[PDB]
């Protein structure tokens, strides 16, 4: 096939999730704190650079499609499976509309402006469809917008990652020094809440599977690749830092910005496309989505994330917490989780006895990625946690719409 | 055999654990609200009494031996089995630890008294091993006397049930009228938030199985008599309230209240050696309990269960939250949840076509109980559900110990 992708063009959407939505925000998220602070990131990317591992080896066995459903298709695979899924979609779509108002706001001014009244609104709902009929021509199609428009935010980012480099200069950070994160034990707690919670995606390339050339070569790359890029390309721009505080061709930026998220959102609904248009399939949803008008893609899913992304998107219009930490919002983010938690026993007791030997090695990174998982989750939200809890209670009463596996019976 | 119980000590230890160690408490986790306010008993009956029945009505199918677990172990049954029992095991140990401290308490003077120093602690250390052993001798022991000292406890109780309604009289509490409680909408959660975190056990006739007579007909009659019973003594009991607010004979209810904790703990402790001694049969844990020392009980199990109860019980000496909602202690509650909400799940993917015919009648109690189940969760400490996660995201990271399962696999 060829009308299915390639490496460079899911690498790309893998660091182009990942990279992403978070940047142009990441150092004011550690300026109120508590920045540098690097540990934080020394860190988090360990843990983070483990889960992309853990995801990276697991698509190298079974890939997949999903992925990060097939595997929890075997930790149970069954209601597991239908859990993992629905609460991992119900999380790359809710994930969108929180991103565009984002999106539309860093050309909050620049053409268009105007983006205020009901405008703003009206015109994210506008966008959110781009994108799904961008994978409707898709998905070779969307994943290559994608590709384009990451590359293009890549101009600022390692813009100063080596021209950032040779500017400043210098002893200033040192000035800035550690600090106002009060003292190692607990201030690395200011870069881990936030660090963390802006690495999401690793799966992507474990969750295309059908939609690249070779799993079991592309895939892997693609995930360590996306995430190694991820990861540097965190570093070397909040090191771009000397004290400040306070929150001609600048202008290329407060656009290479909303760029970032022009390739995003269509990748994102992407896997919303598949991790579950898949679960479609090899068992429940219920589907529906298939029907997969010929030739790949799933007209009617990406057409079904089209009207529910809208419904919530104009009455989240508007409050819902007017940003990030939505109450909404960020679920949709402690959801992805449960999915990494999963992949992570699926990684094991699918290697029963690993399909690779020399195994206190395996049996370690994936004891990470368990730690990031979880660690991820212990320091967040009280109430935003608990809400992920009463999903799955319910998730899982809506096995009563399900009545129908087995396992063990009388 | 007959050294293994029989229906009227099981209905009287599924009634003494429900009843139980909240009852003297309850008026007043209902006066400092949020009083009568009667609805949220009636919504509360309705609810527990339905997952009385999913119990009732599944350990009629099979019983068990656990239960709460064989069912789990056919809505997976490993993984979430394994989850379902480590979860619940470790929330009936934990339970007692913040009992006694409690029961103790009921007989804080008279006699010994002393009860405040080291004291306490000691003196609550020293009981728990006065039923750990009361259960080697055991279960048929252990039953016997619980059914005696929860008797014991019903002198006061329907002692009002009955005598209490010669007595008052009358109108005053029609003084002490409804309000306090802010309007039907949402004053109802006061007693809900309530009635409801005391009312859990309902479990245990399901999760004898093995210590009881016939399991298929004792056992059913075991919970709905408990319950019903418990319900009934809470509502004619928690009616004797004319208006009072501010928090010879009646020194027999001083004691006749610790006297309710004489039998619990030994029932409690009775079904932490069950829902785990099982699942180190069945499949995994790991075991050890086992062993058992020839005929019934499990030696080991309950031995262990002092070890550990106490290694808390003397931290908990002491603050932690120095009484329930503990952040422990009620974690310890939520946790038992989880397997009410696979109990309501299993009786259903097992009922894969109902053992029963008329079936628009089940589909419906057990979609109460997942009411019950789910509702009880999301009225309830932001904080306290957020951890009852993390334990389940952890418990899951522990089948990195238990890397040796199966289905659907490569």
Same mark, same amino acid.
């Given at each position: ?5 390639? @490496?460079?063009?899911?690498? /790309? ?7 992403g ?15 540098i ?13 483990? #889960? ?15 992925g ?5 298709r075997?930790? &149970? ?12 979609? @119900? ?18 001014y620049?053409?268009?402006? %105007?983006?205020?009244?009901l405008? #703003?609104?009206?015109?994210? !709902?506008?966008?959110?469809?781009? &994108?799904?009929?961008?994978n409707?021509?898709?998905? +070779? ?12 935010? %890549? ?10 480099? &040779?500017?400043?200069?210098? =002893? ?7 600090v106002?994160? @009060?003292?190692? &034990? ?16 690793? =799966? ?14 592309? !895939?892997?790359?693609?995930? $360590?690749?996306?995430? %190694? ?11 771009? $830092? ?9 202008? $290329? ?7 970032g ?8 609904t @992407? /896997? ?30 990406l ?8 419904i ?5 219009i ?5 940003? =990030? ?5 960020? !679920?949709?983010?402690?959801?992805? #989780? ?24 395996? /049996? ?22 608990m809400?992920?809890?009463?999903? #799955? ?14 396992h +063990?019976?009388?």
């Amino acid at each position: 096939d060829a009308h299915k992708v390639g @490496l460079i063009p899911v690498t /790309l959407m893998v660091s182009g999730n990942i990279m992403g939505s978070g940047v142009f925000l990441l150092p004011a998220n550690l300026a109120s704190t508590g920045g540098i602070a690097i540990y934080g990131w020394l860190v988090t990317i360990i843990g983070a650079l483990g #889960l992309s591992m853990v995801y990276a080896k697991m698509s190298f066995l079974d890939p997949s499609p999903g992925g990060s459903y097939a595997y929890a298709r075997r930790c &149970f695979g069954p209601f597991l499976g239908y859990q993992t899924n629905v609460l991992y979609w @119900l999380a790359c779509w809710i994930g969108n509309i929180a991103m565009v108002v984002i999106g539309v706001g860093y050309l909050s001014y620049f053409f268009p402006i %105007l983006k205020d009244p009901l405008v #703003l609104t009206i015109t994210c !709902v506008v966008v959110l469809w781009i &994108f799904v009929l961008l994978n409707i021509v898709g998905p +070779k199609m969307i994943t290559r917008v994608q590709a384009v428009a990451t590359v293009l935010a %890549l101009i600022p980012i390692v813009g100063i990652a080596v021209f950032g480099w &040779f500017w400043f200069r210098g =002893e200033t950070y040192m000035a800035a020094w550690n600090v106002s994160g @009060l003292g190692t &034990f607990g201030a690395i707690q200011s870069t881990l809440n936030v660090t963390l919670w802006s690495f999401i995606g690793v =799966e992507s390339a474990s969750v295309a599977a059908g939609v690249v050339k070779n799993p079991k070569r592309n !895939v892997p790359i693609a995930t $360590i690749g996306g995430v %190694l890029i991820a990861a540097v390309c965190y570093v070397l721009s909040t090191t771009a $830092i000397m004290g400040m505080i306070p929150n001609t061709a600048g202008a $290329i930026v407060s656009f290479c910005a909303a760029a970032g998220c022009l390739g995003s959102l269509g990748g994102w609904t @992407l /896997l919303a496309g598949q991790t579950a248009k898949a679960a479609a399939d090899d068992g429940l949803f219920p589907p529906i989505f298939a029907r997969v008008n010929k030739a790949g893609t799933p007209v009617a899913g990406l057409i079904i994330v089209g009207i529910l992304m809208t419904i919530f998107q104009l009455s989240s219009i508007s409050p819902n917490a007017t940003k =990030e930490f939505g109450l909404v919002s960020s !679920v949709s983010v402690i959801f992805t #989780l449960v999915p990494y938690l999963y992949t992570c026993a699926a990684l094991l007791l699918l290697g029963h006895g690993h399909f690779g030997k020399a195994r206190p090695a395996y /049996l370690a990174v994936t004891t990470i990625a368990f730690l990031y998982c979880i660690w991820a989750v212990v320091g967040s939200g009280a109430k935003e946690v608990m809400w992920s809890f009463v999903t #799955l209670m319910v998730i899982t009463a809506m096995y009563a719409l399900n009545y129908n596996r087995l396992h +063990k019976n009388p």
